[PDB]
Design an enzyme around this catalytic site. Structure first.
Site, PDB file in Angstrom:
ATOM      1  N   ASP A 143      -5.662   7.597  -4.516  1.00 28.13           N
ATOM      2  CA  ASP A 143      -6.687   7.599  -3.660  1.00 28.13           C
ATOM      3  C   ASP A 143      -7.410   7.408  -3.279  1.00 28.13           C
ATOM      4  OD1 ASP A 143      -5.868   4.373  -5.929  1.00 28.13           O
ATOM      5  OD2 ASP A 143      -4.524   3.464  -4.273  1.00 28.13           O
ATOM      6  N   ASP A 193       0.506  -1.118  -0.031  1.00 26.85           N
ATOM      7  CA  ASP A 193      -0.059   0.241   0.049  1.00 26.85           C
ATOM      8  C   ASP A 193       0.966   0.979   0.289  1.00 26.85           C
ATOM      9  OD1 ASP A 193      -2.359  -1.354   0.126  1.00 26.85           O
ATOM     10  OD2 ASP A 193      -2.061  -1.664   2.077  1.00 26.85           O
TER      11      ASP A 193
END
Length: 352
Positions: free
Chosen positions: A170, A129
């Site tokens: 994101d 991530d």
């Protein structure tokens, strides 16, 4: 003021009583935010004790240049990023001209956050991530005038063959109002989500005046909600552009598309296709596809491409105020206003 040219309405840390601090490193940013949680008595205050304006002066070019030279060594490294968790007093992280970062900014359950003039690239930790900018459960966030980049390439043997580098911006969860503007995003395979799954539907996001070059997909990958994309320059899209899914609605206006495959589509679910209202873009009819090198491909599951270049749905009245320049003016002028070192300059019709 609070006008961002989009759904987000925030001044960030530029409010009354804001405390200005200079961060010369990633660790300073972390320490500065921690100190901002304590009141006059040294006790923690929920959401933060005071508003902040952090000017980041650090430079991590050596890390960036080293990564650029060995692209495939980044995904397995530890991810690096500053977390802005539950800070609601208002905060602005602005990079000084010449500053650079090899770490991301992860915003979680916060609000009124502005990130500007940051040059972020080639982040390590794509398999864990290692996002450049993440907006999770955070409304009223403005991501403006940043340069987010990596290499639009996938190395062999990465987990899921999709982790060489993580995304640029994101957005997920209850990040109800977000504005992504004047960013220069290049060399990015997965630009960003707008909903992390089929169930994570909603939000009102505005993408305006962004310059995208050499990106593969997700501009964004939209799941429900509303997306207003205006005055963006989309060039060298190697996979697909705006993917409107889960009955999401999009207003795509006055953008310039060129050398793009599947610029506007709804694929990968095989159902619940989203809709789009097309107006004022450089492309006005299918005849323009050849002129601007717009290619279309099919998908293995049922899909809908905008190959007829017609509006497939409606879009509610746009809340905020904005004044889009012509698509031609974008193509002509946008590269000089988007990104870092532009002193947060904006493109007006006067400049056209």
């Amino acid at each position: 003021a609070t006008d961002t040219g989009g759904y987000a309405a925030t001044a960030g840390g530029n409010v009354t009583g804001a405390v200005s601090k200079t961060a010369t490193s990633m660790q300073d940013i972390v320490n500065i935010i921690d100190a901002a949680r304590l009141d006059a008595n040294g006790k923690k205050v929920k959401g933060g004790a005071y508003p902040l304006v952090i000017t980041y002066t650090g430079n991590e070019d050596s890390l960036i240049n080293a990564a650029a030279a060995n692209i495939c060594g980044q995904w397995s490294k530890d991810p690096r990023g500053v977390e802005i968790k539950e800070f609601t007093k208002g905060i602005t992280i602005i990079g000084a001209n010449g500053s650079s970062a090899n770490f991301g900014i992860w915003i979680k359950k916060s609000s009124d956050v502005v990130v500007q003039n940051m040059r972020i690239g080639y982040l390590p930790g794509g398999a864990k991530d290692g996002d450049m900018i993440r907006v999770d459960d955070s409304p009223n966030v403005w991501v403006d005038h940043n340069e987010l980049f990596a290499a639009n390439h996938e190395c062999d043997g990465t987990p899921d063959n999709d982790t060489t580098f993580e995304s640029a911006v994101d957005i997920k969860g209850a990040s109800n109002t977000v504005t992504v503007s004047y960013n220069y995003i290049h060399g990015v395979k997965k630009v960003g989500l707008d909903g992390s799954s089929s169930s994570d539907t909603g939000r009102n996001i505005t993408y305006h005046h962004n310059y995208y070059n050499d990106v593969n997909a997700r501009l964004p990958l939209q799941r429900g909600g509303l997306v207003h994309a205006y005055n963006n320059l989309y060039t060298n899209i190697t996979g697909s552009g705006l993917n409107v899914r889960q009955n999401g609605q999009a207003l795509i206006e006055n953008n310039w598309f060129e050398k793009a495959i599947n610029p506007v589509t709804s694929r990968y679910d095989g159902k619940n296709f989203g809709t789009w209202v097309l107006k004022g873009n450089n492309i006005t009819k299918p005849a323009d596809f050849s002129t601007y090198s717009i290619t279309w491909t099919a998908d293995t599951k049922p899909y809908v491409n905008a190959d007829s270049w017609t509006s497939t749905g409606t879009f509610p009245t746009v809340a905020y105020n904005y004044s889009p320049v012509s698509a031609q003016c974008v193509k002509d002028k946008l590269p000089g206003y988007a990104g870092v070192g532009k002193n947060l300059a904006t493109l007006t019709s006067t400049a056209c």
